[PDB]
Ligand code: BCL
Ligand code: BCL
Ligand code: BCL
Ligand code: BCL
Ligand SMILES: CC[C@H]1c2cc3[nH]c4c(c3C)C(=O)[C@H](C(=O)OC)c4c3nc(cc4[nH]c(cc(n2)[C@@H]1C)c(C(C)=O)c4C)[C@@H](C)[C@@H]3CCC(=O)OC/C=C(\C)CCC[C@H](C)CCC[C@H](C)CCCC(C)C
Ligand SMILES: CC[C@H]1c2cc3[nH]c4c(c3C)C(=O)[C@H](C(=O)OC)c4c3nc(cc4[nH]c(cc(n2)[C@@H]1C)c(C(C)=O)c4C)[C@@H](C)[C@@H]3CCC(=O)OC/C=C(\C)CCC[C@H](C)CCC[C@H](C)CCCC(C)C
Ligand SMILES: COC(C)(C)C(=O)C/C=C(\C)CC/C=C(\C)CC/C=C(\C)CCCC/C(C)=C/CC[C@@H](C)CC/C=C(\C)CCC=C(C)C
Ligand SMILES: CCCCCCCC/C=C/CCCCCCCC(=O)OC[C@@H](O)COP(=O)(O)O
């Protein structure tokens with residue numbers, strides 16, 4: 001079935017691999033070579049998760065947990081039941097995600113639109129690859145990656161964070177959080193602004209973009225503009241994820257102490273370290 | 282190098298836009314400010330005008346009195362030494378009364394009383410700012426969506442500093458005013474309550490915080506990808522669907538099997554963000570008042 | 583089953599209702615679903631069509647009610663390539679000229695978008711008193727180069743969104759002395775030229791023309807913007823790697 005305006009866009013073309021061989025849809029979904037690739041990677045990854053659940057003895061999705069190899073395996077391969085399944089599933093997930101992004105690129109090309117969306121999605125993939133690939137390789141073991149389980153990967157975040165004291169003191173982490181909070185603030189404001197113009201007070205004509213500019217100028221003295229706010233939302237969310245990847249790629253590679261030490265440089269500067277009083281004297 | 286419309290190539294400038302009037306009391310609207318070529322690379326260059334008004338000045342006066350009360354406490358904690366001030370800036374903290382004082386307003390100035398005074402001023406600053414987000418939209422004939430979304434943020438802030446402390450029985454439960462101290466407060470809160478990762482309202486709050494970045498990256502990128510058809514002019518696209526709105530929808534339909542409208546994506550957006558602090562506020566409010574230990578509580582449910 | 587259990591189960595019920603509301607709200611355009619031959623589809627999925635809402639449009643422009651009866655309001659020069667569903671529909675003529683695929687346009691109002699004061703939102707800079715280039719390379723006077731690396735014309739004006747103070751189109755003079763509008767988001771201003779990857783120089787004259795020299799309608803914008811973007815696919819045989 002199609003949306004009422006959709007047929008005119010379902011033309012051949014835009015694929016990057018395979019010519020027209022995979023150039024078709026299944027219901028609403030576009031296929032393409034990377035749709036087929038996505039299906040293969042995802043189906044196999046899901047099969048190996050089911051395998052690992054069989055070995056674990058549970059079908060409870062809240063208990064299934066696929067653990068990476070023990071640290072002693074270093075960067076080597078491991079037996080299926082002792083980290084190998086995690087290893088193959090990780091390859092499958094990487095393959096599915098990258099195939100997803102390239103499928104989007106084919107969709108972008110058939111529709112004649114910019115490539116911003118798979119470019120943005122690539123930041124999420126790089127954050128995933130930081131945690132399971134780049135950081136484990138640089139630390140010397142797959143076993144530093146997170147396990148694939150609903151609650152056990154939260155225990156991994158807890159264990160990893162408290163290895164460094166209060167992880168709040170990681171400064172790149174502070175920047176990432178600031179981008180995450182500011183992004184949600186901006187998303188709330190942007191959704192509210194548009195809806196407040198399109199759904200005005202009862203008894204009113206639909207507002208214009210000039211009402212949006214005026215509202216935000218009256219409120220805080222600046223309106224970033226309709227183009228500006230979408231650039232801004234993209235930059236905030238991408239920067240949060242960039243600084244997330246940055247705060248973790250340095251943790252355990254070039255920084256090993258309690259993160260609260262980083263700022264203590266400021267504390268013990270020779271010209272005020274020993275002044276009696278305050279907090280740091 | 283194909284152009285991607287993240288930064289402007291050619292800036293243009295004309296007479297300042299003074300804005301819509303509708304029912305805005307122009308007596309309280311400043312003149313227009315200067316233009317910023319720096320900002321014009323990314324968004325609009327025009328600064329101002331801003332609306333003042335009684336609620337604004339009350340909010341500003343009170344918000345500055347909050348900031349000054351904390352600041353004066355910091356100078357006192359620093360022995361009035363400016364170098365000690367700058368050195369320990371992030372370590373100072375205006376702390377609430379000790380638990381012995383309960384909800385009493387009799388805690389002496391230097392042991393919690395100044396925290397109460399700063400909190401009074403903050404309480405007045407936020408709620409009059411909230412009134413301002415409502416009255417600015419109403420003066421312009423607009424929906425009240427901004428004030429309603431802002432209420433969700435205020436909900437979490439009210440829980441942290443007011444509602445939960447009162448239900449727990451003492452101001453000592455409230456968040457202190459300092460950079461590092463309020464971070465230490467946050468860490469301690471979770472340890473005291475049996476791992477906040479197992480507070481299901483905390484897990485929802487995270488789902489919507491991550492989901493807000495997921496959605497704004499999706500939507501921001503989508504609108505830039507269709508800005509070559511005027512996509513960011515979302516109101517007229519709502520009124521009169523164009524090829525921008527149609528291609529944006531079909532990208533997502535073809536990618537994930539369903540899609541939005543130019544209007545409806547902004548409903549997805551406002552709820553994704555609002556639910557962050559809505560669920561978050563519920564999660565904090567239940568901590569200690571109802572659930573002592575989220576991990577233990579989770580295992581029994 | 584304490585208050586926290588009651589809260590969390592309640593919230594999940596609320597969330598299921600919110601998602602159902604959000605999805606139906608996002609069916610105000612394009613639904614009901616159609617078969618590939620344009621007739622209504624039998625399977626519309628589990629979410630029902632939203633009930634109509636109305637927007638009263640400013641400046642005497644009337645009212646929009648959505649959902650409402652939907653029509654492309656234009657001929658679509660495409661034909662099925664398959665009896666069964668899910669296969670591409672192939673252009674029967676010149677897809678760029680017929681406005682299909684990535685060249686598609688929508689039958690928007692043949693009127694200009696207006697600002698909050700009821701004035702045309704987009705105007706050529708020569709008709710916009712006080713507007714000027716404020717930073718970056720001024721493209722006026724530069725030659726415009728296509729993806730065949732040949733020159734198609736000269737930039738004679740910038741069309742500006744007045745309320746957002748934004749360049750939206752370059753007005754380009756062709757060899758015959760007519761002009762076309764080029765979307766600002768589809769050009770790269772360089773020090774000595776404006777390069778347009780999307781079109782080869784021979785396709786610039788096919789850009790749909792505007793009926794008035796000082797304004798552009800939403801319908802015309804859609805046709806210009808669709809045509810030019812459509813060149814990424816359909817002028818690719820002319821694009822030098
Ligand atoms: C949610 C659970 C915790 C908590 C956990 C964290 C963690 C963890 C982090 C922060 C971070 C920050 N938090 Mg906190 N935070 C809490 C509640 C608050 C409240 C409040 C009224 O409730 C405030 C004002 C702040 C303020 C701040 C900022 C210092 C900083 C960036 C916030 C941001 O991106 O805002 C989005 C809003 C805007 C961009 C608008 C402008 C906001 C400005 C910057 C706020 C100014 C605050 C203060 C008055 C500035 C004084 C600066 C100098 C000392 C003079 N937090 C609660 C109690 N917060 C991060 C940080 O950098 O810490 C150092 C960080 O890593
Ligand atoms: C006790 C725990 C520690 C701590 C330890 C850590 C550790 C350890 C880490 C973080 C990380 C982060 N923490 Mg911290 N953190 C603490 C307290 C906080 C507080 C707070 C209010 O106190 C906040 C706001 C944060 C915030 C954050 C973010 C900056 C970041 C998580 C986002 C991210 O990386 O996205 C990145 C996004 C992704 C990884 C998602 C990728 C998704 C992929 C590409 C696609 C998936 C598709 C899916 C399988 C499809 C399914 C099927 C379909 C749905 C149909 N932390 C405390 C002090 N924090 C993490 C980080 O920065 O990681 C880089 C991290 O590892
Ligand atoms: C990002 C930094 C940390 C981390 C820190 C946290 C913390 C802390 C929390 C979560 C929470 C969650 N995380 Mg995690 N998370 C990490 C990496 C991941 C990855 C991944 C492939 O990288 C995935 C798929 C998940 C998935 C999830 C969900 C189970 C849950 C809600 C997230 C959400 O809505 O996000 C935004 C995305 C969307 C709204 C889109 C829809 C996403 C859906 C819900 C994903 C389902 C995945 C499925 C259960 C598992 C694989 C499916 C396959 C078919 C087998 N996390 C890393 C290690 N994550 C929360 C929770 O409640 O956990 C129990 C929580 O509190
Ligand atoms: C060791 C630390 C603990 C923990 C302790 C807490 C505590 C404690 C809390 C959170 C909360 C949250 N945590 Mg946690 N958190 C941990 C681990 C994590 C991880 C992670 C990957 O490890 C993540 C991603 C998160 C993420 C989150 C957020 C989803 C949530 C805050 C939402 C928000 O927007 O607040 C930011 C928004 C606000 C605080 C609202 C602010 C509104 C007011 C009105 C602003 C006024 C501005 C003021 C006047 C200043 C003006 C300045 C001028 C502009 C200049 N936490 C661990 C387990 N977390 C909060 C929550 O809701 O929990 C359920 C909370 O209170
Ligand atoms: C970089 C900014 C933010 C971002 C952006 C972003 N994400 C995106 C996109 C964009 C722009 C897409 O285009 C794409 C999409 O289509 O969204 C609808 C995507 C998407 N982001 C998703 C999820 C997601 N994004 C997240 C985060 C973010 N995404 C960032 C905060 C998070 C978290 C934890 O915060 C999650 C869970 C999906 C909805 C979607 C990608 C869908 C996809 O890749 O599909 C192909 C793969 C499958 C259908 C299944 C693969 C199965 C694996 C083989 C097995 C399981 C492996 C996995 C590691 C197990 C994990 C267990 C958990 C319990 C930890
Ligand atoms: C849906 C939840 C998200 C959200 C939403 C949200 N926040 C909002 C809104 C919304 C919808 C608003 O409408 C409102 C707003 O106006 O936004 C622009 C607001 C807002 N959210 C804010 C902050 C904020 N929101 C946050 C979070 C979030 N807000 C969530 C992610 C956070 C954090 C911790 O993450 C913060 C810090 C403000 C920008 C604003 C509320 C403004 C307010 O209440 O102000 C009262 C205070 C004052 C008027 C003055 C304070 C004084 C200054 C601190 C002093 C500065 C120094 C000065 C130079 C000293 C010099 C003095 C001399 C000149 C005399
Ligand atoms: C240069 O020096 C001078 C003196 C000029 C300055 O001004 C410098 C000033 C500073 C250095 C200021 C520095 C300020 C900070 C570091 C502030 C940091 C603030 C935070 C991190 C905020 C954390 C969270 C705060 C919260 C959650 C508060 C909630 C409180 C409210 C819910 C209000 C509760 C109301 C109460 C208790 C009052 C009751 C009274 C009634 C009448 C209702
Ligand atoms: C006690 C249990 C926890 C309760 C916590 C409540 C805390 C305060 C919550 C505020 C609610 C915020 C969610 C609303 C966001 C959606 C806004 C929206 O879309 O509103 C549309 C409309 O309707 C209102 O607009 P108008 O009709 O123009 O006023």
Ligand SMILES: CCCCCCCC/C=C/CCCCCCCC(=O)OC[C@@H](O)COP(=O)(O)O
Nearest residue numbers: 195196199200424426595596597598599600603
């Ligand atoms: C098993 C699951 C069963 C679930 C059944 C329903 C459970 C209860 C759910 C409640 C949530 C209902 C939808 C909440 C969203 C609020 C709707 C709303 O806001 O409507 C008014 C709105 O248009 C006006 O907004 P504007 O037009 O933008 O002013």
Ligand SMILES: CCCCCCCC/C=C/CCCCCCCC(=O)OC[C@H](O)CO
Nearest residue numbers: 189190193212221222223224225226229329
């Ligand atoms: C008098 C001079 C004082 C100048 C003080 C400057 C500080 C204000 C900064 C705001 C950043 C923008 C906040 C994010 C805006 C989100 C809301 C939105 O969608 O804006 C859209 C656009 O503005 C209309 O369509």
Ligand SMILES: CCCCCCCCCCCC[N+](C)(C)[O-]
Nearest residue numbers: 386387388389390394397398401
């Ligand atoms: C303008 C001041 C606002 C006051 C509201 C909060 C009252 C707290 C008073 C601090 C207690 C001082 N005292 C008298 C007990 O020493």
Ligand SMILES: CCCCCCCCCCCC[N+](C)(C)[O-]
Nearest residue numbers: 480481484485488492549552553
């Ligand atoms: C308005 C957008 C709706 C997105 C809904 C996201 C659901 C995420 C589920 C996270 C599960 C949290 N928990 C602890 C209850 O399991």
Ligand SMILES: CCCCCCCCCCCC[N+](C)(C)[O-]
Nearest residue numbers: 028538539540601605626627628
């Ligand atoms: C967790 C957030 C994701 C919400 C999922 C919304 C699913 C909507 C699917 C609607 C199907 C539309 N369709 C195909 C009938 O046209």
Ligand SMILES: [Fe+3]
Nearest residue numbers: 194500504515
């Ligand atoms: Fe938008």
